[model samples]
Target chain A: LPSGSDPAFSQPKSVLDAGLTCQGASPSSVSKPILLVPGTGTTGPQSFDSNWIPLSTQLGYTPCWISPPPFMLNDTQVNTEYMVNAITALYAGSGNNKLPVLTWSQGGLVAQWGLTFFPSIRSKVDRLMAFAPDYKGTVLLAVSAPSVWQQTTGSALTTALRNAGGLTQIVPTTNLYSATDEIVQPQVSNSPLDSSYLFNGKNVQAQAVCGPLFVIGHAGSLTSQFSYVVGRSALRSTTGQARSADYGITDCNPLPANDLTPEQKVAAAALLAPAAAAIVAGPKQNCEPDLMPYARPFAVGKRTCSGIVTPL
Target chain B: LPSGSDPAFSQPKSVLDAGLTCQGASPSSVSKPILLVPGTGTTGPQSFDSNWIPLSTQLGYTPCWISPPPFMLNDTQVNTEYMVNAITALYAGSGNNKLPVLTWSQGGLVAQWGLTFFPSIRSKVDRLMAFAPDYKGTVLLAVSAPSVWQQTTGSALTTALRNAGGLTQIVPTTNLYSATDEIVQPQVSNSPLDSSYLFNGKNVQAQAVCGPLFVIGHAGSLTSQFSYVVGRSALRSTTGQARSADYGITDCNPLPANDLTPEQKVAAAALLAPAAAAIVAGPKQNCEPDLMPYARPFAVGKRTCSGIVTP
Candidate 1:
């Protein structure tokens, strides 16, 4: 069905209300409530409603969106508090059923921060699917913004998030990021550390998994058909069992075909092609070098030293 | 007694034997067996026998040392495998009792690598103590030796050691590195990562805990009276309870009066002052920068974009 100009869509309060149920289908209540969070410079419904609300309704689930007041959108901590309130309100309305969140771009980071701050939030979330998340701060932002840059990369929060009790707290977290994401450079922003307690094997690169042709740009990542297929699978997955390979571009299914409408395909393709050449030509390398030292026997002229150092 | 020329020290096979017990005192067996492992270019007992053997006998504990053959000492993987074998052998001898490890330099890396390769090793051990350990690859090696540098930093073993079941595998790991450590550069080598499941609160700097005057040079680190006090405290500690501040240079007892002989104090003090001025001036700085990015409201000449980029 085509998107209709429902009167409730015009009422902004309806977007933020937890009591709002699906208009198209009666609540099946079989699956967990799906909470859609927005990225930078957008409201929750404005960011996810077109792509998620209709699919959620068809799938027999109530969709909740956090339409944070304009002021709350800028600060990460405020956005996290806002998300906490939205989840608690939704949990209250859904008879305390756990929720599965699918966040886009900046929303992914905010949700992670929320999980880090309130560890109890992990129990409330069944699955977490983040689209085009900048786990480590983006260098593109670093080039233009100083304070914000300081706040994102190795910042206290990012460090706290990387700790075992931080993101490691979240179960079945599927991090889906794009290599061709021009806005957030590459590698450093994409590759998470090799901590056993964190997202060691769960990090999925859209280009590496989906191939260069099926690449999802930073902005179109949330709305892309390919992203939805994988994100949905992750959201429905049991703890410790979610993997992107189950739904993403893989050997079992070579050609993904048009899993989207004609309009969606055109939008996805057009949104990505502008800087595609530049992104394909060059991908950013990780700034931090993974280094450890080893002492060895070395000779410098006459001195035979046992404490001579070497890198491994 | 002044540093004795014990015949057992001259015999390498005797040092490696599991049946070898302390001569001065009967094994109290009150504390867990202390396993001493060697650093690079040296065997285990060769590195620790002089200082640790006498101390272990005096402290009433059996001192077990993993003296890997010369062939096994060079490669970290080979050394770790040897340590594992030695530990299993020692465990079998001691009725499967857990042992504590006190490693010097390269031995610290090997012991850590051993814990990474076999997580079950954590269960077989009590406390882990490292003196002058090079956790993060040393920058000093990168300048002069390229091959060793390649093998130490970002090496397959080091990377494997850091992952979830890696360093986080060990319980009560106490990393003590010197500020005047000429070999393993200061800050980079000393600072351990913050992992809640791993050494969350266990990482400590010797200079930071011990006063500036009580600094231990790289060579003397394992045998230094100051290091022995803290390292022994860590080894004697129960699992999840090892701290350097308990015996390090501080106000409660600033003078940490000599546990070593008068001759040993003169040697330690003399060895430290040669390059003291340069060493004292060059304290290590963290190479990696702490960075986090945020998109904030920015003002252009006339336009208002959501975020403007700048570092």
Candidate 2:
């Protein structure tokens, strides 16, 4: 599991630096390169586990990461400039190929802004994959600091990003969010209101992929091994039609009672131990009530929630 | 002429306060009211001459204005809050009526931001009339202060405004800009790139209304009598289809040489004398070279550039 204290989370040596390096020749290389932009207060590699690079390699995909400064993390425009420089370097180095961007949290919104301000940059992006992004302002932030929420959601810059071609530029886009997300309210992260703003519905979301039973919390959605099935399928799906169909996960049947075997359950439980402990402690443990529903599954062996937890 | 130092330019007592007061019952008070939101560094009344309020009344239109503070002028979110308050007040005061908004310079963009952030506010806005708005950042600021330009255009706030429902909220929106604009580069203010961002195509421009011969510079466009013809027509055209046709001005022939008569020309010239003089005196006088092609028309009384001036 990824740790916050990992050196990969440290600020990049410079804007040109990539936090996670390449392993070997990728198993699957698209015409465009892939740049993974992370969430608020987190870097690229730090956003994912050690399996990210190795798994991408095994899948024949080349993945790179950017470690943006965590301070004032919402300052998307400045971060996008760094992204622009990085992409430009990649564009030149990779025989002038266009690229796709996979972002988590605020980084997804930053990619939208980057496309809005720089048409040249937008033209270079072929696809966009956003995981649990806050397209609208998060209610969690609103509760913490109303001013920051207003600045983030209601500001002219955010308005520009949403209205301009920010969301419309990418030909094929995928938004992967979970209903159990607590950091960004589930309603906002998986909002239906986003359809028009997101290229008039061209940018789609995978919310009920495993049929409503799947419970992928914010942190767990990014770190949990089962969540990658959705991410990998989304990235692997070629056309918009194919991606939309696959995102539905319509063909898969619900899982049995013991979805995770003994070994897999241990690893999954270990990976979520901190979250589980926090949930058990409640608000005093910094766990919001929104996260309480997912706590039972981790504390005990069975999920108290109604959703069916399918094995990947 | 509207002086930047005019007392009317001063901040108002509250959001309910209109920099300019109303004149009796307006002749053409369309069920909705009209709110005038002004540009940066200027309040509502300060943005217009004394004639503006009285002229709207004379045309049968009722006009109200909101005077937002000029400090931290680029803080669009804060300004949007004030505008939301002002518009809400206007809405309730006018018997819960929807209204049209007329904005100038930065205020135009601010209106967009306000509408984008608050759809409740957007629902109340019937029409949006913007005069020489910098939807895209101005190159003048790019050369003068790159940081300000970046903040105004490339800032996360601006990105949000442009990307959100900023340009798409209004059913009938009219963007009136001029080739002679210096503050907001004409290319940006009258850009074709705005089409997709604007309700897929609803936001329209009045670039060819009278013809390419019309020389209403940045400030001149807002103050000129000829420009008012466009603004008034835009406001009066109720339906979207009608507004588009009327805005196109396809049936009207271009004005001939001396479209402004002796008295009108004198008043028009006086209104733009400072700008005209600045143009002749060059950059030292604060006229950017970008305005050079239109300078001769203001200085020599005859336009040198050509497309059509048919009468």
Candidate 3:
């Protein structure tokens, strides 16, 4: 129901002029500011030198780099704890008190952890953009043990910690996990917070037979041309509609229609009345839960292999 | 490295069926037990007529509905808790403790929650499929506070309670959201768990941003073909990748090969070798992601509107 231009956070008119308005948030009121937490062993802005540089430049945002303590692995909790100081520093410096954090790879989990360990700083992070991050670590790479399952130990730990810390409470977070990832499998990465969920106000549970299938296998590709598709998404907290260009643009239904003119309103009603009347004349609709047998059976036809795993 | 058809669970031939004998394990050990959870209700099997009929007929497994406790506005947690009991019961009753659950719609979330809440049962659930599900509550609609969002306060509370429960665990799971959905708005639903995500991965988020655009304002009429499209997805899901007529003659990528076998293999090998390889040999070879960017500022010809967005 919210429009594309609708503001998610507070923003000032001047913020837009300054190119600082993000998702319609006023620039001045935002204090906690935008922080770009880097992945493992990444020191300074070089972590962002390639993709982040162009993105930051395009979005008119200052990518605050969280320099972790020296001699730390790329994906570890200790380094994440060290970066939380930067978040602490940002709030103190900005004076507004609340801020949104953007983290990539290893920094994502740390951002989540930081929120739990430092609740006082919870106010500092208004939103978080976990860029193609690891919620649950990758299955094939966990060195601790031979996982019979694809999910790694790091992922399992993240899950346990998230459940224990109650992180889903204060933070409205979005995780960007790749389906075509070779690092962290989607099955291990984007597992929902809870199993039983409400679908269109209906109570339902997920079936236990499907593992994460990857459309893109790995090599976190950042070749998206639309800044909104990648850059705008990384910093802003709102997820857009699940749409495909193939089905035609989803949001343009009826073409930003308005009854600005009386003639247009008359035309609209004229176009709509007959359809409405037809619905009244149509057969009664079935409101039953899928009681029909075998929604569809798997009958095999011509077989051909799908594409191999690769970054799109 | 896992093949698509390869079952993760152990699939041993029933030792008795192995001939001359009874080989490794008994007939019971080879069979995989299944758990079928229902969509959005607390009704038991006896309370309802036919259920689990989908899996029972198609996949050929012993599927028992998580015979959930009756649900009410106040009892989702109890219903979910009952599902956990049913899972445990199924696991205990099976020849082995291993079990798999197949569900549709809201059933996707409930099953995933069931595994997360009971980590011990994590090993029990072999795989999970969330067909056209809402992993995250359709916050877009609920927050929008529309009639559809407020259709049932009980349903909203279920999502709210789940949120309040502070659950952020991704069990081994697969999410299947529809592209053209009328039963439910997937754009409002099928959102990812990460509240803030900027993806950088190997997977090309199969987006339709550049495809044809349709503006079906709220109740725009979908020609007579709309129902066919709705039913087509279930068709695509079940039979697109298979070689069968039940789902129709349509194919997943069942198109014919245009390249010479050896030539195509060589071209494929070269492209597969690197992150950015020209998919073709000569002029066509330069038509890769990197080379494509050269045309970007784009031909003055086709830069009318950018980044597809519909109403």
The TM-score each candidate achieves on chain A is 0.64, 0.63, 0.51
Expressed as tens digits, the lDDT of each residue in B135-253 for candidate 2 is: 65553311211113322444334444454435454546666665434345423233465321255334334345545333344554565554565666666776632254443454322
**lDDT tens digits, residue span B148-232, model 1:** 3322454333444454245453657876665544345423223453111135435655546654333334555666656666766
Q: Give DockQ per model, in order.
A: 0.01, 0.01, 0.01
lDDT of 2 by residue, A100-200 (tens): 67776666776665555545665567567666666654533212111133224443344444444454535466666654343454232334654213543
On residues B146-233, what C-alpha lDDT tens digit does candidate 3 reach at each position? 1112212223323332443313434334333333222223232123332111112011011222111111111111111121222223
RMSD of candidate 3 to the truth, in angstroms, is: 27.4
Q: Which ten residues in a row have the lowest lDDT in candidate 1 chain B?
A: B290-299
Candidate topping lDDT: 1
Better of 1 and 3 by TM-score: 1
User: Per-residue alpha-carbon lDDT of model 3 for A212-246, expressed as tens digits?
Assistant: 21122222322112212433543443432112231
Error of 1 at B299 (Å): 49
* Best DockQ among the predictions, by candidate number: 3
